[PDB]
């Protein structure tokens, strides 16, 4: 569907740019993501390293662990955009480490586990925020 495909594109495009160094609502989301997601990574490098270790991703397809933790994160019934942006930013940190340990790692299985957790498990919440527009407005700075 639209929300799944739109989200997958946004999250993959961010994850691929991050790993390599390379609709309209989607362009906005992508811009916001670069600014906020980069904010998250810088200043939380040491925490992110620590989590990556404890997760112990063996390869590009070793996502089952990442899925379970992400599900766990949301199991308190709290939903907000700071958390969502954090999940995606960690996603990009993991993508960068994947390419440094195998230069033709596909970022796709990872973007997919993130998109799945987000869109299947927070579908109606996202729809109610008007999707990626809620994200863009939340992180909107003047």
């Amino acid at each position: 569907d639209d929300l799944y495909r739109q989200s997958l594109e946004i999250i993959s495009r961010y994850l691929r740019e991050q790993a390599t160094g390379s609709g309209a609502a989607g362009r906005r989301a992508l811009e916001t993501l670069r600014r906020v997601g980069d904010g998250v990574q810088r200043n939380h490098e040491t925490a992110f390293q620590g989590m990556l270790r404890k997760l112990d991703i063996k390869n590009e397809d070793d996502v089952k662990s990442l899925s379970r933790v992400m599900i766990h994160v949301f199991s308190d019934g709290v939903t907000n955009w700071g958390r969502i942006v954090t999940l995606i930013s960690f996603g990009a940190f993991v993508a960068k480490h994947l390419k440094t340990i195998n230069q033709e790692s596909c970022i796709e299985p990872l973007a997919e586990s993130i998109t799945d957790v987000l869109v299947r498990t927070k579908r109606d919440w996202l729809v109610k925020q008007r999707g990626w527009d809620g994200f863009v407005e939340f992180f909107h700075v003047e």
Binding site: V40, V73, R83, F138
Partner: peptide, 23 residues
Amino acid sequence: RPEIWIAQEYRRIGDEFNAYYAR
């Protein structure tokens, strides 16, 4: 449990970003 620690780290950082842009 490694998973509890990872989850908590995610929420700590996530909620901090939430609070910052909420205010």
